[PDB]
Design a protein around this ligand. Structure first.
Ligand SMILES: [Mg+2]
Ligand SMILES: [Mg+2]
Ligand SMILES: [Mg+2]
Ligand SMILES: [Mg+2]
Ligand SMILES: [Mg+2]
Ligand SMILES: [Mg+2]
Ligand SMILES: [Mg+2]
Ligand SMILES: [Mg+2]
Ligand SMILES: [Mg+2]
Ligand SMILES: [Mg+2]
Ligand SMILES: [Mg+2]
Ligand SMILES: [Mg+2]
Ligand SMILES: [Mg+2]
Ligand SMILES: [Mg+2]
Ligand SMILES: [Mg+2]
Ligand SMILES: [Mg+2]
Ligand SMILES: [Mg+2]
Ligand SMILES: [Mg+2]
Ligand SMILES: [Mg+2]
Ligand SMILES: [Mg+2]
Ligand SMILES: [Mg+2]
Ligand SMILES: [Mg+2]
Ligand SMILES: [Mg+2]
Lengths: 64, 95, 49, 243, 110, 95
RNA sequence: GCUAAACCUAGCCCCAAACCCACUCCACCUUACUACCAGCAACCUUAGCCAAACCAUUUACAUAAAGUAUAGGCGAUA
RNA sequence: ACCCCUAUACCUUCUGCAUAAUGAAUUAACUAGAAAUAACUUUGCAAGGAGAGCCAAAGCUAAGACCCCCGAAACCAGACGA
RNA sequence: CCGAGCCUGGUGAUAGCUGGUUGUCCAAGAUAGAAUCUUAGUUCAACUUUAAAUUUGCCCACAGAACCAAAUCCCCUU
RNA sequence: UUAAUUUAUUAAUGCAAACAGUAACCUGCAUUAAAAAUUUCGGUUGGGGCGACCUCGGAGCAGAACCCAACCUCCGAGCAGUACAUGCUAAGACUUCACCAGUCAAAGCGAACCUCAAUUGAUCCA
C-alpha cells in the first residue's frame, strides 16, 4: 500500500538516487546538491566540465 | 537556442518568436505582416488592407517556430473570451 | 460530460456538486499552477440533459 | 571524495572545537547574529510588494545592499555607516556606451569631539553623515551607545563604546573629587544601556582579540604535583583518623 | 471507481447501456474499460494514417475479426484491411469506424 | 554620502537567502549625493545670550556649522532633546 | 634458433560512511636546517578567451512552479 | 618456381590522380559520433494517462532509436627571471 | 626561436581552414535557383532517403497560346 | 592616426561640499587637454591591386508557355500629376524560381450617376 517507492530502495551517490539525467545535467546536479562539500580541485574540475559540456551541447554538434 | 540551460538543463525558448507569433493548438502559427505600420502614405489601399491581415505560417517555418519554443507554449489554453479561441481546434480536414 | 458522470455513479446529484466532488469524480482536472480559476459550465450537451 | 561538513561551516565548527568554545556565551552570540546594516548608499524599497508599471500586477521586491568597501583608515576613526563604493558606470548613463570602473569616495573631515562618559577630546576622521547621525542621537556618547555594532562600521568606535559600557558598569571615578554629584548626574543621563561588567569587557572585540583575552585569563603557571600529592596524603591521614 | 447505479430505463441519457446478463455465448468476448465503456478507440499514426482499435478481445479473435469484416464490407465496398494481434487481444482496423463499431458491439451485447 | 541606484535588476531570492550577484550588478547608476542638497537648520537650546542669534533659554534653529564648530563645544548651546527640554521649561516657569 | 613473447597483483578510480593531520633529542625566516645581544608589517570589483557566425552594450559559473514572470545591440542569450 | 596471356599500389583531395599532388619504413598495443523537442516503435492503460505538479477534440505513460578526434598564431590573470 | 619574455592558470581557448574518423552484407541515391561582411561558408528552395495516406502520374491528338528557325506549353485517347 | 567608442588615469579650470570672516587640503558633479585603452580595416573581380560596379525598371542575347548568365550590348528610376469613398470589407487566383516582400479581384456594405514602366527600404528602436 505505497508506504515506500522503489526509488528509496536504490543506494548510491546522494545526488542521483532515483533520477536519471544526461552528462551535463548530472554534473549540474552534483554541483548543486554536493558542491559546497566537494574538494577544491575536484570542484574546479567539475566546473570546467560543465563549461565544456554546455559549449558542446548548446553549440557544437549536428542537427541544430 | 540553448538545448541545455546551465542551471536546470532544459530547453529554453527563443523569446523573440513568442513576442512576434501566436501558436494555435492545431499546429498553425499566426503572424502579423511586415511593414504594416510604415510609409502608409505611399502605400495604396489594397496593399494596406493586405498588410493589416493576420497571415498564417509555412510548414518549415512552423517547424522552426516549434523548435524555438518549448512544450509550455504548445499547451491547451482556455482563456475567458479569447478572440482567437475558435481557431485552436481545426475542423473538416482530409489530408 | 456532467450527464455521463451522473450516469456512471461518480458525482452524485443527490448531494451538491461543488468543485471538490467534480475533482473526485475526475470529470474535471484543474491546475492552479498554469492559472486555472476553476470550472466554466458549457452548453455542449444542452438538450438530452 | 567529499567533505563531511560543507566549507561555509568550517569557521563555525572551529568556534565549537577549541579555545573558542571556552569563550563566554554572551560574546559568541554577537559574532553569530549578523543582522543587516541600515541603508546608506541606496534608497530602500518601503514595502515588500509594490505593483510595477508595464503590467498591472503586484510582485515582491527585495532591497539588495550595495557591497561597500571599508579601507583601514575608516577603522582607525569614526566614519558614518559608510565607506568607498567600488562599482562601474556606463559612459554617459546609456548602456550602449563603454562600461568603465568607478570608485566613489566619501568626504572625510577632521573634528574634535568631547565625551562626558570618558572626559576627553578626541580628534576623528568623521564625515558629514556621521555628524548628522550624532546630531539625531544628540550626544556623541549616545550615538556610540545607541548605534549597533554592524552599523558603527569602525573598530575604534566599538572600542569607545566598550569603554563607555565599562565606565557605566564600574561607576569609576571619572571626574575625580569635587564632582561626585556631577558624575552621578552623568551616569543617570545614561541609565539606559549599562550592561553588567563581565559582558562589557568583551564588547567591540575582534575574534582574535577575544581569543587572546581568553588565553590571558586561563593562563596560570602549572600547579606543582608535589603539592597535590601532599594534599592527598593529608586527606588519607584524615580518613585514617576518622576510622 | 464505483460500479454504476442500476437505472430504470436503458439506454441511459448520454447513450450509455450496461453489458447484458448472461453473456452472449460466442467464440470471443470483449471486456469493458475501467470506466464501463466499450473499448473502441480512434488512433492517428502519421498525420495521414487514421485507424480504430478494438483492444479487449478474448478467446477467438479470428472469429471476431471475421465478423467485423462481414459488418464493414457494405459500408466500404471492400474488405476493411485489418490487423489482429493474438498476444494483446487487439484489432487494428484501417480508417475510422468507431461509433458504428461501438453500436455493433452494444447490439451484440458486450 | 553618495546614493547609487543599481542598473540591471537583481533577480530576487528567498526569505532566508542571499541573492548571488553578477559582474553586471556591480554596474551602478548614480542617483544623488546627500551634499548638493538643500541644507537643514538644526534646533539648539541656548545656555547663554549670544549676539542677535539667540537669548538665554530660547530654542532656536541655526546653521549647522555654527552649531557644531562654535556653540556645542564651548557649552553655549545644548541639543533639542525631549530630556533637557522639560528642564528648560521648568526653568522658564520658575523665572 | 636468437631477438623476443607471455603471465597477476602492485596499486588505483568512483562512491558510501566518518569532520582530518601535525614535539625522541638537536637544528631550522641570517646564505633555513645556522647555540649566545638594542626596531617595517594583511585586507583595495577579477580579466580575457569565448558566443553573438565581425565587434564595440551584452554572453550561464531533492522535485515542481518554469525555462513562467522578467531582463536583453528586445539578440546572442540570460 | 619462372618463361605465355591479363593486369596504371592504397588513402586523402579533387571537375579529373599510376600520377612526377597529401600521407604512410615496418610491427605493438593505444587512438575519434555524446545530447532535446518532433517524429516513428512496440508495450500499458484509455475520455483519460502519469507513483501529486504535467498533458489531454485519442490521448497519455514506456522504453528503443540520430548528433566525433587532433591542430594555431592568440587574448587575459597571477607568479619567476638583469 | 622578443613587433614585445618565460612559467602556471583561465584553456578540452577558437578555427566557415587542413589532416584524420576503425566489423560484414544488401538496398535507394548526382550538382534548377535565394539571399547572405557572401561566393573556401550558409539558411531557404531544388534534387535525394525513409515511413505513411493516396488518386491519378508520365506518354499525349484535334482545338487553342500578338501585334510590333529547331522546338515549347496545353492536351483526350493509347 | 585627421578611423569609431571611451575616459576610467593624470590636467588644470568651474560649480558645489567644507571652511573662515566683514559692511588652502580632501570629496561629488561638470570642462577642455595630455596620455592612453577597446578597435575594425565590406564585397564583386578571367590572381590581387588600380579603375569600374553593388537597389529598382524596359529592350536585345533568350525568333513561338515560363525560366535563363557575363566586369555582355543599349536605354532609363530613386518621381510627378490628378484625386480626397486613394472608404470598409471580402469569394477566388497570380507571384520575380525559397522566405520576406509583391500583384489582381467577383460579390457585399457604404458611396457616385486613379494616371504612370521603375519612382523604393525589414526588425528593433525613436
Ligand atoms: Mg496514439
Ligand atoms: Mg522557493
Ligand atoms: Mg565572436
Ligand atoms: Mg563558428
Ligand atoms: Mg577578424
Ligand atoms: Mg586541381
Ligand atoms: Mg587514370
Ligand atoms: Mg614513380
Ligand atoms: Mg604520390
Ligand atoms: Mg591537403
Ligand atoms: Mg596540398
Ligand atoms: Mg614522404
Ligand atoms: Mg573507440
Ligand atoms: Mg579573436
Ligand atoms: Mg649584472
Ligand atoms: Mg578544436
Ligand atoms: Mg568561409
Ligand atoms: Mg543501387
Ligand atoms: Mg549585411
Ligand atoms: Mg576582394
Ligand atoms: Mg583582374
Ligand atoms: Mg513563388
Ligand atoms: Mg464591388
Amino acid at each position: 500500500n505505497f508506504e515506500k517507492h522503489p526509488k528509496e530502495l536504490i543506494r548510491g551517490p546522494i545526488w542521483l538516487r532515483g533520477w536519471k539525467g544526461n552528462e551535463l545535467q548530472r554534473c549540474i546536479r552534483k554541483r548543486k546538491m554536493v558542491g559546497s562539500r566537494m574538494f577544491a580541485d575536484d570542484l574546479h574540475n567539475l566546473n570546467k566540465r560543465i563549461r565544456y559540456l554546455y559549449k558542446h551541447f548548446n553549440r557544437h554538434g549536428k542537427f541544430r | 537556442l540553448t538545448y541545455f540551460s546551465a542551471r536546470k538543463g532544459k530547453r529554453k525558448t527563443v523569446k523573440a518568436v513568442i513576442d512576434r507569433f501566436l501558436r494555435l493548438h492545431c499546429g498553425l502559427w499566426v503572424r502579423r505582416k511586415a511593414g504594416y505600420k510604415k510609409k502608409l502614405w505611399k502605400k495604396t489601399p489594397a496593399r494596406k488592407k493586405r498588410l493589416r491581415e493576420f497571415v498564417f505560417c509555412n510548414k518549415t517555418q512552423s517547424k522552426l517556430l516549434d523548435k524555438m519554443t518549448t512544450s509550455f507554449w504548445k499547451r491547451r489554453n482556455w482563456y475567458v473570451d479569447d478572440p482567437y479561441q475558435k481557431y485552436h481546434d481545426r475542423t473538416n480536414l482530409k489530408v | 460530460r456532467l450527464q455521463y458522470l451522473i450516469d456512471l455513479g461518480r458525482v452524485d446529484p443527490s448531494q451538491p456538486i461543488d468543485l471538490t466532488q467534480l475533482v473526485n469524480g475526475r470529470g474535471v482536472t484543474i491546475q492552479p499552477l498554469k492559472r486555472d480559476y476553476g470550472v466554466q459550465l458549457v452548453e455542449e450537451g444542452a438538450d438530452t440533459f | 571524495p567529499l567533505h563531511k561538513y560543507p566549507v561555509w561551516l568550517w569557521k563555525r565548527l572551529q568556534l565549537r572545537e577549541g579555545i573558542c568554545s571556552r569563550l563566554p556565551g554572551h560574546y559568541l552570540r554577537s559574532l553569530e547574529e549578523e543582522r543587516t546594516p541600515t541603508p546608506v548608499h541606496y534608497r530602500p524599497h518601503g514595502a515588500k510588494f509594490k505593483i510595477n508599471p508595464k503590467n498591472g500586477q503586484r510582485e515582491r521586491v527585495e532591497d539588495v545592499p550595495i557591497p561597500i568597501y571599508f579601507p583601514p583608515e575608516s577603522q582607525r576613526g569614526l566614519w558614518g555607516g559608510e565607506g568607498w563604493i567600488l562599482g562601474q558606470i556606463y559612459a554617459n548613463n546609456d548602456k550602449l556606451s563603454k562600461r568603465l570602473k568607478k570608485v566613489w569616495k566619501p568626504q572625510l573631515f577632521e573634528r574634535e569631539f568631547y565625551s562626558e562618559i570618558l572626559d576627553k577630546k578626541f580628534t576623528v576622521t568623521v564625515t558629514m553623515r556621521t555628524l548628522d547621525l550624532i546630531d539625531e542621537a544628540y550626544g556623541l556618547d549616545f550615538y556610540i551607545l545607541k548605534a549597533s555594532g554592524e552599523d558603527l562600521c569602525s573598530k575604534f568606535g566599538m572600542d569607545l563604546k566598550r569603554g563607555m559600557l565599562l565606565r557605566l558598569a564600574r561607576q569609576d571615578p571619572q571626574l575625580h573629587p569635587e564632582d561626585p554629584e556631577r558624575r552621578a548626574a552623568i551616569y543617570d543621563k545614561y541609565k539606559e544601556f549599562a550592561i553588567p561588567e563581565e559582558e562589557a569587557e568583551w564588547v567591540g572585540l575582534t575574534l582574535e582579540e577575544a581569543i587572546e583575552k581568553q588565553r590571558l585569563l586561563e593562563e596560570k603557571d602549572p600547579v606543582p604535583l608535589f603539592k597535590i600529592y601532599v594534599a592527598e596524603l593529608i586527606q588519607q591521614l584524615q580518613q585514617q583518623a576518622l576510622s | 471507481i464505483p460500479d454504476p447505479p442500476k437505472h430504470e430505463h436503458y439506454p441511459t441519457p448520454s447513450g450509455w447501456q450496461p453489458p447484458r446478463d448472461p453473456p452472449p455465448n460466442l467464440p470471443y468476448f470483449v471486456r469493458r474499460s475501467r470506466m464501463h465503456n466499450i473499448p473502441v478507440y480512434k488512433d492517428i499514426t502519421h498525420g495521414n494514417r487514421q485507424m480504430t482499435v478494438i483492444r479487449k478481445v478474448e478467446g477467438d479473435i479470428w472469429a471476431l475479426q471475421k465478423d467485423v469484416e462481414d459488418f464493414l464490407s457494405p459500408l466500404l465496398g471492400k474488405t476493411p484491411v485489418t490487423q489482429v494481434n493474438e498476444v494483446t487481444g487487439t484489432l487494428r482496423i484501417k480508417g475510422y469506424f468507431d461509433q458504428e463499431l461501438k453500436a455493433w458491439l452494444l447490439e451484440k451485447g458486450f | 554620502t553618495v546614493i547609487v541606484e543599481r542598473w540591471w535588476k537583481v533577480p530576487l531570492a528567498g526569505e532566508g537567502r542571499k541573492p548571488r550577484l553578477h559582474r553586471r550588478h556591480r554596474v551602478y547608476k548614480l542617483v544623488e549625493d546627500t551634499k548638493h542638497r538643500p541644507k537643514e537648520n538644526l534646533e539648539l537650546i541656548l545656555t547663554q545670550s549670544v549676539e542677535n542669534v539667540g537669548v538665554r533659554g530660547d530654542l532656536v534653529s541655526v546653521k549647522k556649522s555654527l552649531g557644531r564648530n562654535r556653540l556645542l563645544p564651548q557649552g553655549l548651546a545644548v541639543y533639542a532633546s525631549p530630556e533637557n527640554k522639560k528642564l528648560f521649561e521648568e526653568e522658564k516657569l520658575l523665572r
